[PDB]
Structure formats: C-alpha cells, structure tokens
Amino acid sequence: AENRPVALITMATGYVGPALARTMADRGFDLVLHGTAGDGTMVGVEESFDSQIADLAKRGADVLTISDVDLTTRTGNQSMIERVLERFGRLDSACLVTGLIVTGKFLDMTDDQWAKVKAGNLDMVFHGLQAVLPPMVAAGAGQCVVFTSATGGRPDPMVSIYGGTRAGANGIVRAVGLEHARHGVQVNAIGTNYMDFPGFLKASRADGDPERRAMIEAQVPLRRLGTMDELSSVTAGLLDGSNRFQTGQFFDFSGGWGA
Amino acid sequence: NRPVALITMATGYVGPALARTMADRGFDLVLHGTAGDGTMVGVEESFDSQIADLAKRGADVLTISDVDLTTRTGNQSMIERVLERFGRLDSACLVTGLIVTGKFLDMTDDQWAKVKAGNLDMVFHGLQAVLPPMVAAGAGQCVVFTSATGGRPDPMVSIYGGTRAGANGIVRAVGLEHARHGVQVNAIGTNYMDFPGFLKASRADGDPERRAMIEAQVPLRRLGTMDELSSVTAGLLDGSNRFQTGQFFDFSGGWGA
Amino acid sequence: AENRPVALITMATGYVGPALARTMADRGFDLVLHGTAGDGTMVGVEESFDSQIADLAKRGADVLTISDVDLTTRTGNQSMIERVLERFGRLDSACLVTGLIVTGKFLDMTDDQWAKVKAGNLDMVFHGLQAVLPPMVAAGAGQCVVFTSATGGRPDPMVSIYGGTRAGANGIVRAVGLEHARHGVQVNAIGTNYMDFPGFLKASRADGDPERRAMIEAQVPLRRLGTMDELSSVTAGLLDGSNRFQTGQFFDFSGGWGA
Amino acid sequence: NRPVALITMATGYVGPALARTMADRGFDLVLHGTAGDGTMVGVEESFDSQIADLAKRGADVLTISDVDLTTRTGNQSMIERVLERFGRLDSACLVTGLIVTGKFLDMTDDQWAKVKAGNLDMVFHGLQAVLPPMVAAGAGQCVVFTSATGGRPDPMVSIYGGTRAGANGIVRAVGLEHARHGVQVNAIGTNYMDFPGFLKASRADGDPERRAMIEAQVPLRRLGTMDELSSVTAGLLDGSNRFQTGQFFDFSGGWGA
Ligand SMILES: [Cl-]
Ligand SMILES: [Cl-]
Ligand SMILES: [Cl-]
Ligand SMILES: [Cl-]
C-alpha cells in the first residue's frame, strides 16, 4: 500500500552505483543492487553491499542485493529481473551499467578481444533491456538509463572496437527508447569519460601518478575529472519521475569532451 | 550570500516555474520579462504574482521589463542592473527566439531579419553580456533556450529551425571556449510544451480532441510540463552538475531524438 | 608494368556490385569479385559471375572471383585477401558490402536473431577491415567503402537491433578511418535505404505491388527509389583515387530520408 | 541543348576546377566572380585566363561581376542574367561566407554583422534566387559551400562556425522542402584546402614551417586540392546522383569526421 517505486542499479559496488543508490533512496525508492559480492578489499568493489545496505536501510530504503549473475547473457538478466519482481512486484527505474574496456590498435585486436567488447558493450544492453522492459510496459510507465560511454559519441583511434560498439549501444537505445515511448517508458543513454573513480584512473594510468593525472585533466574542456555526486544527480533526474519528456536520447557527460 | 540567477522572458514559458525552484535552491533572482498583469498579451504569470511567492521562498527579486534583448545595449544594461543590485551573477537562463514559419520561397526580407534578431542576435548579445562577470568570478552556469527545431530543421520551418541550429552552434563554441574559466554554457531546445503560448498557437487550448491529436505527434504521447522542464534546467544552473558544457539537449518527448 | 590498381567488391552478384564493377573497370581497375556462385536463376544472384566476367573482360579488366566464402569470420576474410594478393600482388580499393536484415519488435527478438544481426552487421565489418587494411597500410595508400545502412544514422522502432548495430559499424568505421589516415588509407561508410533492388523490395514488401511501392516511395523526400547507377557513381568516387580527402565519415544515401 | 551550371566566386576556390569538369560533363556555364587579372586580391584564375580552355572543352560561358551576393538585389539580378542568356538553370554552386575569428568576447557588432551577411544572407538570398527556375523545371541540383566549421563550431571560431551551422540547417530544411519538386540542395563544408583564403586565415601562406604545423592538424596530414573538391562537387551537380538532398558533407581530410 506504500506504493514505493523500485530502482534497479547494476554494477552497483562501484562507478555511479553507490552515490545513485543513496540519492534514489533519499527520493523515496526501494532498491535492487546488482554487483560483486565481498568486502571493500575485493577487486572492483569500491563500496561493499554490506556497507551500502546499512546506509540505505538507514534512509528507509528496502534493498535487495543480487550478485554473481552474468549480465552478458539472457539467463543472467532474466534471473535478475525475476528476483526483482519476486521481492517487490514492480520495477519502475533501471540503471543498466554496461561495458568491457578494450583498447589498442585496431589491427592488433584479437577475436577474443572482439568477443569481449561485444559481450560487454552490446550483449549487456540487449539482454538488460529485454529483461527490464516487460514489467515497465505492463505497468504503462518506466524509466531506464543505460550507461554506455562518451566514446560512443566520438569513436576515436585506439578505441575503435570499444567506442564503435558503444555507438551501437547508443543506437539500440535510440530505437528502443522511441519504440516503447507509447507505453510510457523512457530509455536513455549516458556516456561518460574522465570520471574520478578507480576504473578510469587505471585505464588512463593516472592512478598514483599526479603528473599523469594532471595531463589527463588538461584534456577536458572543464579542466577537471567529473565526480560521482554530479553524475548521480543527473542520472537520478532521469530515473526519479521528475522528467518524463526525454527518451531515445544520448547524453554526453565528460566535461565537454564529447560536445 | 545567496547566489544570483538571471531568467529572461520570465513572465511566461519556463520562467515562473524555474524562478520558483531556483528560489527553493537558495538563489536570489533577476527576472526580465513583460510588465503588466495576467491580462496582457504575453503575460502568463505577472511579475506582481511571482514576487509575493518568491519572497516567501526566501528570494530577493529584481525585475527588469523595459529592455530589447536583440541588441548590445539592452543586454549590457540588463547585466549592469544585475551587478548593481546583487554584485554577482552565478547563473543565467537566456530565453531567446522569434517564431516564423512558412514556405522558404515565401519568406520576406522582414521575416528573415526578424528571425535573425530573435534567434541569433539575442544569443550573441546575451552571452556577451552575461559571461564577463562569470569569467571574472571563475565560475558560472548558463542555459540558452533555443528550440528543438534546431536539432532537425524541417520543411516549413527553414529559416527558424536553421537559425536555431546556428544558435546551438554558437553555444557549442562558446561553452567550449569558456570552460577553462569554470563557466558552463549549454542549450536546451523544446517542442510540444504545456504552456499557454504553445497551447494557444497549436489550438490545443480548451480543446481536448485537438490536444490529443497534437500529443499523438510526440513519441511519449504527452505535452511536457514546466515543472519538468524547470527541474532539468535548474539542474544545469544550481551548481549540482559542473561537468557538461557546449552541449545541446532536446526536450520534446523524443521528437528530436 | 601497367600499374593497374585493384578493387575488391564483396556480395558482388547483387546490390551495387555489378554496376560498381563496370564503372571501376572503365576507370582502369582490375577486379576481385566476391559473391554467390550460380546463374541469374540463383537466389540472391542478380547478375551471375559468368555474365559479369564476359563484360568486364571486354572492358579490359582482369577479374578474380571468390565464391562461397563466409565473410562473418576471420578465416573467410583472411583467405579472401590472401587470394587477392596471390593473384594481383596489391589491393588499392575495397567495397565491403555487409549486413543481415532482421526487423520486428525489440522484445520479440530472439538470441538467434541477435547473433545473426551481429554477425552480418558487425563481424563482417571487423573481419573485413582487419583483412583489407594490412596491404593498404603496407603500400601507404588505399581506399575503403563499407556499406552499412541508412538506418544506422537513425535507428528507429521495428529496426532496433539492425539499425543499432549498423550505427556501431559506422562508429567502427569512424575510428578506423581516423586511425589509418596516417597511412594514407581512407575508410568511409555509405548507408542506403529505399534502393531499387530486390533485397529492399522484399524487406519492404513492395515487389509486384505498385500500390505498396508507391506508398514506400512517398516516404522518400525525393519521392523515388534510388538506382544502382547513381549509387555506383558515388561509391566509385570514393574508390577511384579522385578524392583522397574524406575519411572516417558516414554518407547517407536514401533520397533525403536520413538527412 | 546543353544544361547550365552557375558557379559563384569562380575566379578562386573551387570555381576554376569545377568549371573545367562541368564543361567536360557537357554543361554551359555562368561564372560569377571578381573582375580583373590574377594580381587582384582573391583572383586565382582570372576570367581571361579561363575562357580559352573552357571554350575548347565545349562550353559557352557567361561571366558576371559586381553583384552583391549578400543581398536580394544581387542574387536576383544574377539569376535573371543566367536565364536571359541561357533560358534555364540546371545546377548551381553557391560559394558563401566571410571569415572572422577571435575570442567570442572580443567580437564587435561590425564583425557579427559581417559574418551574418557572408554566412547566412548569401545562403538565404542565393537559394531564393536559384530555386524558382529549378522548381518550375521540375529538376535542379544545388550545392551550397558553407564550412567544415559548421559541423564542429569551436573556440576562437564561435560566430563564424556557429552561423555556418545555421547555414547547414537552412540547407537541410530547404533541401527537404523542395525534394518533391525534383530539386536537390546539399551543403559542402571544407577546411584545410590548398588555396590563398585558407592559407591566409591559418597564417601558413608562403611559410613551409607554419604550413607543416597546419597540415599536422588534419587526419590525412595534408591540404586538400581543388581537383579533388571539384570532383566531389560535380558529382552532386552533373545529374549522375539524384538521390541525396538536405545533407551536409564534410570535406576536410577527416577533420570534421
Ligand atoms: Cl568514465
Ligand atoms: Cl515548446
Ligand atoms: Cl537499401
Ligand atoms: Cl577551406
């Protein structure tokens, strides 16, 4: 009877997940966090589920955690949404964080690297959207954000297959966001670059290297790395019901780099 | 002290709702717009009606109503009055444009002059006036309202949509050019918005059948509300997001996707 | 000796292939035609190799045909280019026709449909470019056109996974064209729609139906279907050495539909 | 009877090479340009230097000078002279623009007026003049030269690049709007072309060192040639391709990709 909306956030033990969960809880949502199990020492885990759950529960959110599902597959994504609906009976918002980073010269790319970028950058999008949309269509309302990459808006040398498949994800999102708009469902993509979190600081090798860090920031028009507080704010605005008038769109979030 | 937001054409369109939420977010306000009560032609919410409410929200308000924003003089004078009153300018929402439609080969020199003045001169002179105090302060946020037509200039909208695309291009360059000074400049272009101006021009006002026909042109099958638009606009003007600049955002229910 | 340049054209028994081969021969090229074996009464064969070879040889062009090789894989594309180089010792231009059409509601798409579109719209591009570029890089000059689809410039409802993956192919071409510009190797994409050839008439269901065809033509700003003579002229202009100053670009060729 | 192609600014830029290949392709020619010999400012191939070669290729040639193509009067006069001479206008190559660069906040009202006249008025009035005879005939092909900067309006090029984006938008709408009449209108935008206007704007003229620095900005690492550009341009004007309209083509060595 409380009629609390439910937001799914994937890869939620890092990147935008933790800050987005906090603000979605502040906005009255119950939460489903997909991510990697383990404590803060686990690789890729920036904020563990145990730490997040305690804070999110303090905010009044009910939280379901989902770990060790392979979201590059139909099975993983279908299982995830079945568990969402079992717990909460509804899905109002979904933040699908996708991707697998591969960089290098185009002619150096192997079949394995090609397979991996397709699995991360496209299969996660295809199967994720096939899983989250049915309950949204059934309800006549929903909001989805797919995280792709700012490289999808300008695929450049050394990120040919990563950036190119990100552009494909953006295109799928355009079609899908337009196709389900008549059912009250928004699907948009956000693509970031130059964000201050471990994943970026490693791919750019700015980690523990102030001189590298500074050269990287100088590549950004706004001369800084973006923060997860800023990104969670924009992302929540596309998932909290406050804006029901954009769909099928791609939003660059990279300090002007993808303008 | 409280940061200061300038909003133009603020007696209609997004202005009133944006003023309300910016006041909620802790800003003082400078409202440029049209003098008079709600019975005047352009006035959707009078200055008089807004001042009472915005003061209750904690905002000091300065109104400016006698300036032509197609010229250097009008915009320079507006910003001079902002700084005289509050000593700062943190955010600016510049609403621009003059609508002309019709066959390209029917457009007169006067129609061409007018769309350039509304769609381009207001942007050029507006940004030249608001940016200097922001650059001097090392921080600022600007949203220029152009049009969703700028993202897809179409038949029967050639000179309007085309000059809107030009305004978006100016915003791209200017937003990238002043990024190193901590200043953001972005553009928003709408269509199919639920406000009296569009309702009356489309004949959806008071006409449910016509409104349904108009909504059917929109992927999301509705008209956007000013509360929604003001939320998105304020998110680019309230300090919460300092990581987008030089960008154009379509806000038309998917119509410009 | 004669220093005749060599152009590869794939899927050349239909679509733009036959007209492009004629005009490239006229412009002084030797030709490698990949395609489907069989006479004109074969499915998908608009002009058989036998009929094309007679005419192309009359124009002075040497022709190598490459039949029944699968271009969705590394092995097929690598074998194709090995045979090009064994026969002619060079590859100056390549027209890579790619794709596999699937349409329908996004939520009706099966894993098999998804695999199929990825293989046609992305794997053919990845493996095709990995095969054709090395000899062009070695020579310090080359020109490539990848045929994707006008839907890649505007992925729409009912065309989500096809148009979206086409957008990804366009993005790969952008990055690859920019990345090999230092080697003098242009890589551009052309995306068509509403072309007067069987493949479109079937997907649109306008064949033998003047009313449906008239409805389809009315969706085109220029109010007609495009011809292979027009398309081959534009394509040859990106492959004949006359224009070496565009790369990484996508060109819509759909009567204004993708403008 | 030969079809007729109008080419403006034809004493420099793409004009001379385009005239040569359009003559080869069977066209008679109207060449608008600057009167005088090659020592005149901007004259790369004088009218006098071109005429013998063009006649040998089979073309009748009318030359036109001293019309202000930023105005309705000049463009209307030009097309009237085309029709009086040849009775038809099949193809038009409208070269437009006036380069201004510098910091946005340094731009004067005079600089703003000049870029609007060059980058927008030339397009508006040029298209209003060439299209009526093409629509009446049920066929025509037009290329408007804007700038590659219109695809990516950048710092230091704000009002030039921005208004070029507007010209591209006008061309999109107009190309779509007259497609039902069998008329194509497309834009080509160049940068990094090997001709005096670009060399001077980039300050690389007559200076191998600075030219190398400029070429380093281009993915294909050189300046484009007029033979290449005229090939692409003629392909949109020679009747061979009647299936693109309302489009913008970057021609800048990948710089605008
Ligand atoms: Cl990032
Ligand atoms: Cl609106
Ligand atoms: Cl087609
Ligand atoms: Cl140039």
Author numbering:
A (entry chain B), C (entry chain A): 4 to 262
B (entry chain D), D (entry chain C): 6 to 262
Question: What does the paper behind this entry write?
Answer:
Halohydrin dehalogenases (HHDHs; also, haloalcohol dehalogenases or epoxidases, halohydrin hydrogen-halide-lyases) are biotechnologically relevant enzymes for the production of chiral epoxides and β-substituted alcohols. In their natural function, they catalyze the reversible dehalogenation of vicinal haloalcohols with formation of the corresponding epoxides. HHDHs possess a catalytic triad composed of serine, tyrosine and arginine. Protein engineering of halohydrin dehalogenase HheG for thermostabilization revealed several residues with positive impact on the apparent melting temperature.
Interestingly, whereas T123W yielded wild type-like crystals only, we obtained six different crystal forms for the T123G variant, which may already indicate an impact on the dynamic behavior of the protein. After solving and inspecting all of these crystal forms, two (T123G_1 and T123G_2) were chosen for final refinement and analysis, since they encompassed all structural changes with respect to the structure of the wild-type protein. Superimposition revealed that mutations T123G and T123W have no effect on the overall fold of the protein or on the position and orientation of the catalytic residues S152, Y165 and R169. A more thorough analysis of the variants shows that mutation of T123 to glycine or tryptophan leaves backbone hydrogen bonds to G102 and K119 unaltered, whereas side chain-specific contacts to L103, K119 and N124 are abolished. In variant T123G, on the other hand, the additional space generated by the missing side chain is partially occupied by L103, resulting in a slight displacement of a loop connecting strand β4 and helix α4 (residues 101 to 107) that covers the catalytic triad. This intricate movement could impact on substrate positioning in the active site and may hence explain the increased catalytic activity of T123G. On the other hand, the T123G variant shows the closed active site conformation already in the average structure obtained from MD simulation. At the same time, its loop mobility is significantly lower compared to variant T123W. Variant T123G was the most active one with a 5-fold higher initial reaction velocity in the azidolysis of cyclohexene oxide compared to wild-type HheG.
